[PDB]
From a paper:
The first step of their urea utilization is the conversion of urea to ammonium, which is catalyzed by two distinct enzymes, urease and urea amidolyase (UA). UC converts urea to allophanate, and AH subsequently converts it to ammonium. Biotin is covalently linked to its biotin-carboxyl carrier protein (BCCP) domain. Its biotin carboxylase (BC) and carboxyltransferase (CT) domains catalyze sequential reactions in urea caboxylation.
We present here crystal structure of Kluyveromyces lactis UA (KlUA) at 6.5 Å resolution. We speculated that the mobility of the BCCP domain prevented its crystallization, and hence removed it. This variant (residues 1–1741, KlUAΔBCCP) crystallized with the vapor diffusion method. Despite extensive efforts, the best crystals only diffract to 6–7 Å resolution at the Shanghai Synchrotron Radiation Facility. They belong to space group P212121 and contain four copies of KlUAΔBCCP in the asymmetric unit. In the crystal the four KlUAΔBCCP polypeptides are organized into two very similar dimers. The structure of the dimer resembles the letter ‘m’, with the AH domains at the center, sandwiched by the UC domains on both sides. The other is between the UC CT domain and the AH N domain from the other polypeptide. This interface is mainly contributed by helices αH and αI in the UC CT domain, and helix α3 in the AH N domain, burying 1000 Å2 of surface area. In the KlUAΔBCCP structure, these active sites are located more than 70 Å apart.
Residue numbers in the entry:
A (entry chain B): 489 to 614, 621 to 732
B (entry chain A): 1 to 610
C (entry chain B): 977 to 1737
D (entry chain B): 245 to 366
The structure:
């Protein structure tokens, strides 16, 4: 019913175990489908059979799994899921994924039965602000800003002094620009260097963190007068 | 000091633990002194020097986990067929003698396990025969009566074990050489699945068919020896093959045992009585006994005799024979047999291989619905002078029941069935399919407990000692498993009425832990004549520890097991006390949410409640 | 930062890990530890666990301070205000260093064991008996760490309460200015200042604290190895201002072993007898090389007859001695170096008396392992504590001792510490001493064949047997053979064997005499020796390292300069070591620089000298140059310096190590203390025997760039896994047999002999 | 039962480390192109030593398998049928079998099994 459907991201697990596609029938109207709290990068449904009135028909794909391979297949099947039985529209009973009560009783579970299937729902779910972004900062905030950037598919640019040439945020970034020198004033605070850095790397935006040029309004204004988007409030507000 | 004759492996280990490195060295030195080589004792071609015993023992002390070595300081004999580097190798042929610079892989394994080699043991020359008379080093007598033959070709090894000099010995078996001498000497003879024991460092003599074999006084020791030597060696022995995972460990009580429709005895009247009685005893273990025409198997045996397999022996010896060594070095019966190979060309060898494959089609169709064959080990207890009179015909007859086993890729265990009127022993060999060696052992155990009730079982020449504890088995070690760890909570528990389903799928008991504090247990509305529980993982907070049994279920078999699991149960995962997650029975909410459902958590398990 | 661990279940926003250099420049934020609970109380508990589970070492942090706050009644009852922390009562369960003392280090016992084959010394206390007394007096588990005081001690402010004791040398000891007794459990209050002054008798004393001192382990031990910036309080001796934490069971989350015993004054019969007059008898086992194949008879007599004076250049690496000059049985040491004390590098015994040229030194607990000189005798395990109390100017005499007597003394110290009962300590006395030095050669196996050479077994200390292959000669096959011997003990799994240490043509075997005695181990070894089977065509896994090296850079040259102005200002290998190689071999200096950049150096052993420092040999026989090791050795060598000792090559993996090889240039250290380097090696020592090192040319300034990059794991070491094939190598020798032989026949002569003569002065 | 019906998009395809062409210059181009095409399906290509397999191949030729043809054809050949019915290259290949003992046949069966140990691991 879930991530093993044709086109979804655990389908491969059926091919690994030499499964063979049989058909695409529905349950009888006796089920409810829940989208479990996403934890992994894979979202997973759980089926729930009801002593009525309220179940619906959910879409299923049915596979022949060699007796010889079924062991290999279930070893890939984690809590709170399991293999039990399900009733098809036609009245035949057939092995299927089921789900522990505990499973669909977690915070974040969404009742998905309306959509009648798990495909429908992963389509009713499925916007890049900037292409490359420079971080006018160092240390821990730089690293944290870059995690978000990464997750967003946005290219990131580090800047560093000389003592920082070996720091995490330099490593984490897609690109980096040495500012040369040691002191705060020599490097991170030097607007000219920073803006040249964003130029040099074609960064459309600069995000400052806190400290340094963060609450510096000349700097916010320099960004504006340079066609680089300062990720922060206006020089005036500051 | 103290008598050592007829000690089990366990007897030896017990001595070593409670003794000192020096008084245990003395016991082996003393054992070595009592043995005599050459023609004085025909059983020994050669014996180790006292210096070599020291060497092996220094080697041994050298080890730092002794008391984990299952054969620590245990003496063994090895067929002069099989290389041990401390002694020459002869094949019962004086001018063939050579000094190996390296141990048999098989020997090397036993030494790694702590054993000490005492000597090389006499055999029919080039391991050719079932009689044991065909050695220029002497004719080894039956351990019970010197008028009788010891059996061959592993003659020394049987003798030596039979009188308890040594609790284990190595032989070889192409077409009976590890089975016939067991029957004639009241021993256990284990003939393992082909390729299980390496043949690296044994002199080839029917390479494609040959197996290393073991003699023991009891099942326990045969088992330990098997576990030690059952090891792959693919790149150095072209016929080596790895045992698969999850070997069966017990046949069902139900098993189908086939016996032959026609049992020729060639005039012999005592041995039929032992066989009949032995068959009665198997029936009494609960086995299904089925009478079956062994035609195809005998056609296979005839193919061996008619065919060109003799060219294998010739292939291994022709360079040597052309050396023209002194006639007195040779047994003439052996050599004439081996030279029978000259009349077969390559084309001939193929024609017979074709016929062999054709017979096997028939043989595999026959065995499809059979678990085990039960066969007399041999029809006769030959007198020394009887095989002197008819030096070929006695041999042929002693191979009535042995010749087809290796050609058919079967395993085999020769096991005592008792004594004839004249106080000689014989017995039965149980024949199983590929990789059944552990289950054969167990089947013997079960056979023994009926045939030798009240611990009345003799061993070797020791007609007035009794097996107590020594025929018991560990089964295959956890080493060999590869399956899903599965927790059962309900009707699949030991003693309830679906336990059998685990046995059908060759499950193995692992342990009996409890869940974590997170579970309730229900009794569901009974519909069948079986009542069924469902587990529920809970977290309001109010769960108990529910009791579980955990089994290893082989991966290739899990399909068969889950197919027997009806709604509303299913297999998911469960949390044990220790925090490990493990596959387990679960239950759809719908299951324990019916009218008739009973909250059973109180009892902590499903047994208490039923 | 030296170790960095965070709870993985919390969110922690940080920018640091094991390896990171934290500067004072910008802002000292390390990490932000963020916890998410069901409600305030759940979150406060989670935050405490998270803080408990946060281990960051290498810098002083505010973790303890955080822990105390997160734990307070204040924070929980939510009586929080912008003012609170300004009047918050913070008391560290710890002491504080008001003054450091000359050389005060955290140590433990037995120390950093397990790694002598690598050249990681045990460290731990220099006088282990006093150390363990001190611990026992306070009822510590014997694994507890304590402070070693050398020459004069610290003054410490205690911020919490505990019990204390001092043992070892005579030192005046103060608690809030009232004299305090040694060997008794002193109760310390809080605000107390403990101060221990100058050591009047002996060199060293020991200050124990109930519950031990709380410092992270490195390689199994909390002992300080200062040379390697390893262990103890952040890899070094204490400093003014340091703050060391204790293990109060109620106010602690600690992995230190809780005390075993109630505190108790040491019985006085169990106290060791320190000399009274700067003069000492010191028991040793004869061997390995106290035999006439190496030293003349009479010099062996003089060695034990005359007294030795302690030299001002003595410390935990070893205690240097002044006395009679050695008469040698050989005219030179051949390929292993010209000076007759020079030896095919082999692994030394703790306590060994090493003849670095014509002067000896006692190898102590911070001492070298794989080394290039002969050793005469070895201080008995249980006698080493004496050597830990020597001061310059002391006189000593080495007193011969049988294996058995040596065990007696040792066992008496263990029974003394374990039971703590009057009368159980045995000490040197005339009826314990052998009448005359004995023969260190325990047995000789004759040569049998080409791959199965003669074997010489030498007694090498209370704790070891040295196994030597061949004539005094290099032969690659013998290296594989040693590997096979080691394999035979493992196959055999021997009980009692502690550690086997590979050298060039030898292996040193350490045993536990309580599990196997000398005679027994000898026989097993003789016996396994015959089980070794292999043919000339062997192969081994071999990693190939390509390493940048600056030829004769400033720091290499300065190491020689320092040696000229501080120790020996001229010698035949002075003023320039490379010119010496060039001159004694009759080549141009740039021929020497050519070989270094072309030769394939096979690692034969590790810890020549310290932290996985290799002893390697060119695979091309035409790359083997005559030479010599220093006489006497340097006391200082720079990190990464490359040396040539006779025909052997070494990389000094550690900064500030004694050294004797001819100095030639500099690489990067092949020791990665924090395993942060950019390579696929899973422990700190980058090399393994049978590995290969090749050098490629860089500029001094290009090398300093690489060095900094590599210390921060931003330098990509060129390493390839492959296989060394002896049958392919034999092949190669033939395709160049004629070149090789012509090179070999023409190597020595009268010129090399004049050198060998001069070198010997 | 359950014969596989598809390799994974991932499968491991082995090609030989050494590809002898015996002077032929055109065919190597097609092979190269074909391997390229396989790579492009998403298959993983690994270059592998085919020695043991060519060792196995020579056994068919040097070895005694030629005796299988002789076994299948000798009764007929002994009739000496008209030379013009026979092709001479074939019959001579086939009569080459006479040079093999039963013993020889085994000797070669052994070597075959030894190679197969290596091939099945490979």
């Amino acid at each position: 019913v879930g991530a093993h459907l044709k086109g979804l991201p655990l389908h491969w697990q059926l091919q690994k175990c030499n499964a063979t596609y049989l058909s695409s029938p529905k349950t009888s109207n006796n089920y409810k489908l829940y989208a479990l709290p996403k934890v992994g990068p894979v979202l997973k449904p759980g089926l729930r059979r009801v002593n009525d009135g309220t179940g619906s028909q959910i879409q299923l794909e049915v596979y022949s799994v060699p007796y010889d391979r079924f062991g290999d297949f279930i070893a890939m099947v984690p809590e709170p899921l399991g293999i039990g039985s399900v009733e098809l529209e036609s009245g035949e009973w057939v092995k299927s994924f089921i789900c522990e009560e505990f499973g669909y009783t977690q915070q974040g579970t969404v009742d998905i039965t309306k959509f009648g299937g798990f495909k429908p729902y992963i389509e009713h779910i499925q916007k890049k602000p900037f292409e490359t972004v420079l971080i006018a900062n160092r240390g821990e905030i730089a690293v944290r800003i870059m995690k978000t950037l990464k997750r967003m598919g946005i290219k990131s640019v580090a800047v560093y002094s000389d003592p920082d040439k070996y720091s995490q945020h330099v490593t984490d970034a897609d690109f980096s620009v040495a500012l040369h020198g040691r002191t705060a004033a020599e490097t991170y605070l030097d607007i000219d260097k920073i803006i040249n850095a964003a130029k040099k790397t074609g960064a459309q935006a600069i995000i400052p963190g806190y400290g340094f040029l963060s609450e510096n309004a000349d700097f916010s204004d320099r960004c504006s007068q340079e066609n680089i988007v300062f990720v922060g409030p206006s020089g005036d507000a500051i | 000091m103290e008598s050592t004759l007829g000690w089990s492996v366990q007897d030896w280990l017990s001595f070593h633990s409670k003794s000192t490195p020096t008084k245990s060295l003395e016991l082996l030195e003393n054992l070595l002194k009592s043995q005599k080589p050459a023609p004085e004792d025909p059983a020994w071609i050669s014996l180790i020097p006292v210096e070599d015993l020291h060497h092996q023992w220094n080697i041994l002390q050298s080890k730092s986990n002794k008391e984990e070595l299952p054969l620590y300081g245990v003496p063994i004999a090895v067929k002069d067929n099989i290389d041990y580097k401390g002694l020459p190798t002869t094949a019962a042929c004086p001018s063939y003698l050579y000094q190996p610079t390296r141990d048999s892989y098989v020997v090397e394994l036993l030494r790694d396990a702590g054993a000490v080699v005492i000597g090389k043991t006499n055999l029919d020359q080039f391991a050719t025969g079932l009689v044991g008379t065909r050695s220029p080093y002497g004719k080894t007598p039956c351990v019970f009566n010197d008028k009788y033959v010891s059996g061959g070709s592993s003659a020394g090894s049987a003798s030596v074990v039979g009188r308890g000099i040594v609790p284990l010995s190595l032989g070889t078996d192409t077409a009976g050489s590890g089975r016939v001498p067991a029957a004639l000497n009241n021993l256990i003879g284990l003939k393992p699945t082909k390729g299980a024991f390496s043949c690296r460092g044994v002199v080839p003599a029917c390479k494609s068919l040959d197996c290393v074999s073991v003699f023991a006084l009891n099942l326990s020791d045969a088992e330990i020896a098997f576990k030690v030597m059952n090891k792959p060696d693919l790149l150095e022995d072209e016929y080596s093959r790895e045992f698969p995972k999850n070997p069966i460990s017990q046949y069902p009580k139900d098993l189908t045992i086939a016996i032959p429709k026609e049992v020729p005895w060639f005039g012999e009247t005592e041995n039929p009585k032992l066989y009949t009685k032995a068959v009665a005893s198997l029936k009494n273990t609960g086995a299904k006994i089925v009478v079956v025409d062994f035609e195809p198997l005998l056609e296979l045996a005839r193919c061996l005799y008619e065919g060109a397999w003799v060219a294998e022996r010739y292939c291994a010896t022709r360079d040597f024979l052309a050396t023209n060594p002194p006639e007195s070095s040779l047994d003439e019966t052996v050599v004439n047999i081996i030279k029978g190979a000259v009349k077969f060309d390559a084309a001939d060898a193929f024609k017979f291989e074709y016929k062999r494959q054709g017979i096997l089609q028939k043989v595999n169709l026959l065995l499809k619905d059979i678990d085990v064959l039960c066969v007399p080990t041999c029809p006769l207890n030959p007198k020394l002078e009887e095989v002197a009179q008819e030096p070929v015909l006695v041999n042929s007859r002693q191979g009535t029941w042995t010749n087809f086993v290796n050609l058919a890729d079967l395993a085999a265990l020769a096991v005592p069935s008792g004594f004839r009127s004249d106080g000689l022993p014989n017995g039965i060999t149980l024949i199983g399919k590929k990789f059944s060696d552990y289950a054969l052992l167990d089947l013997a155990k079960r056979f023994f407990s009926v045939a030798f009730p009240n611990n009345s079982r003799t061993y070797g020449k020791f007609v007035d000692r009794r097996i107590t504890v020594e025929d018991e088995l560990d089964g295959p070690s956890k080493d060999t498993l590869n399956g899903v760890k599965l927790a059962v909570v309900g009707a699949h528990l030991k003693g309830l009425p679906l336990h059998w389903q685990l046995q059908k799928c060759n499950a193995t008991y692992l342990s009996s832990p409890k869940t974590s504090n997170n579970y309730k247990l229900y009794a569901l509305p009974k519909v069948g004549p079986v009542l069924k529980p469902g587990l529920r993982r809970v977290n309001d907070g109010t769960g108990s520890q529910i009791q579980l049994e955990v089994y290893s279920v082989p991966y290739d078999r899990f399909g068969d097991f889950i197919a027997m699991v009806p709604e509303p149960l299913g297999i998911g995962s469960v949390e044990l006390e220790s925090g490990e997650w493990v596959k387990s029975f679960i239950c759809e909410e719908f299951g324990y949410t019916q009218q008739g459902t009973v909250d059973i958590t109180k009892f902590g398990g499903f047994k208490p409640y039923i | 930062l030296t170790s960095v661990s965070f709870p993985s279940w919390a969110r922690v926003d940080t920018w640091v890990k094991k390896g990171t250099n934290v500067s004072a420049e910008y802002d000292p934020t390390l990490a932000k530890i963020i916890v998410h609970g069901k409600d305030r109380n759940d979150a406060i508990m989670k935050l405490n666990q998270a803080l408990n589970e946060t281990a960051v070492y290498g810098c002083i942090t505010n973790i303890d301070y955080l822990r105390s706050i997160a734990s307070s009644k204040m924070f929980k009852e939510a009586k929080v205000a912008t003012k609170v922390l300004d009047s918050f009562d913070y008391k560290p369960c710890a002491f504080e260093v008001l003054a450091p003392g000359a050389n005060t280090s955290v140590q433990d016992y037995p120390g950093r064991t397990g790694y002598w084959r690598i050249g990681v010394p045990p460290s731990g206390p220099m006088d282990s008996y006093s150390f363990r007394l001190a611990n026992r007096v306070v009822g510590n588990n014997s694994k507890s760490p304590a402070l070693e005081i050398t020459l004069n001690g610290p003054k410490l402010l205690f911020h919490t309460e505990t019990v204390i004791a001092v043992s070892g040398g005579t030192v005046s000891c103060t608690l809030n200015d009232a004299q305090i007794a040694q060997n008794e459990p002193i109760e310390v209050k809080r605000g107390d200042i403990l101060s221990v002054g100058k050591v009047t008798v002996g060199c060293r004393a020991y200050l124990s604290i109930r519950g031990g001192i709380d410092v992270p382990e490195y390689l199994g031990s909390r002992s300080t190895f200062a040379m390697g910036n390893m262990g103890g309080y952040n890899g070094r001796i204490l400093k003014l201002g340091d703050v060391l934490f204790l293990n109060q069971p109620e106010l602690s989350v600690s992995s230190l072993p809780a005390p075993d015993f109630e505190p108790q004054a040491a019985p006085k019969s169990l106290l060791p007898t320190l000399s009274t007059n700067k003069d000492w008898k010191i028991g040793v086992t004869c061997g390995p090389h106290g035999s006439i194949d190496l030293f003349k008879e009479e010099y062996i007599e003089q060695f034990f007859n005359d007294k030795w004076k302690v030299h001002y250049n003595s410390n935990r690496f070893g205690v240097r001695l002044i006395g009679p000059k050695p008469k040698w049985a050989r005219s030179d040491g051949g390929e292993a170096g010209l000076h007759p004390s020079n030896a095919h590098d082999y692994v030394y015994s703790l306590g060994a008396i090493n003849f670095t040229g014509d002067e000896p030194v006692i190898i102590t607990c911070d001492g070298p392992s794989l080394g290039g000189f002969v050793c005469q005798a070895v201080v008995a395990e249980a006698e080493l504590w004496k050597v830990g109390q020597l001061t310059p100017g002391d006189t000593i005499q080495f007193v011969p001792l049988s294996y058995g007597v040596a065990r007696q003394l040792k066992e008496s110290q263990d029974k003394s510490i374990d039971n703590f009962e009057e009368g159980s300590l045995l000490e040197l006395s005339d009826d314990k001493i052998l009448p005359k030095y004995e023969n260190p050669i325990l047995a000789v196996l004759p040569k049998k064949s080409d791959l199965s050479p003669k074997v010489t077994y030498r007694q090498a200390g209370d704790r070891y047997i040295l196994v030597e292959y061949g004539e005094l000669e290099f032969d690659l096959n013998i290296c594989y053979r040693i590997n096979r011997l080691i394999h035979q003990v493992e196959r055999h799994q021997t009980v009692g064997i502690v550690e086997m240490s590979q050298g060039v043509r030898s292996v040193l075997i350490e045993f536990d005499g309580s599990k196997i005695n000398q005679k027994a181990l000898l026989k097993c070894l003789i016996a396994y020796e015959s089980e070794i089977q292999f043919d000339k065509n062997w192969n081994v896994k071999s990693k190939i390292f390509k390493l940048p090296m600056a030829f004769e850079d400033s720091k290499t040259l300065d190491c020689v300069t320092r040696y000229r102005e501080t120790i020996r200002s001229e010698a035949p290998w002075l003023p320039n070591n490379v010119d010496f190689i060039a001159d004694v071999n009759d080549i141009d200096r740039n021929d020497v620089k050519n070989m270094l950049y072309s030769a394939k150096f096979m690692v034969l052993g590790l810890g020549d000298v310290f932290l996985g420092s290799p002893c390697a040999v060119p695979l091309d026989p035409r790359h083997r140059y005559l030479g010599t090791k220093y006489n006497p050795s340097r006391t200082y060598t720079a990190r990464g310096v490359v040396g040539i000792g006779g025909m052997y090559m070494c990389i000094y993996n550690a900064e500030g190590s004694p050294g004797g090889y001819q100095l030639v240039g500099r690489t990067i250290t092949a020791w990665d203390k924090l395993v942060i380097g950019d390579h696929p090696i899973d422990h700190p020592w980058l090399l393994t025997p049978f590995d290969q090192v090749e050098f490629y040319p860089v500029t001094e300034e290009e090398l300093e760039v690489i060095i900094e990059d590599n210390d921060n794991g931003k330098f990509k070491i060129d390493v390839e896994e492959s296989i060394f094939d002896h049958k392919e190598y034999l092949a190669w020798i033939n395709e160049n047999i004629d070149s090789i032989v012509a090179f070999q026949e023409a190597q020595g002569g009268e010129k090399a002999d004049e050198f060998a003569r001069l070198i010997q002065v």
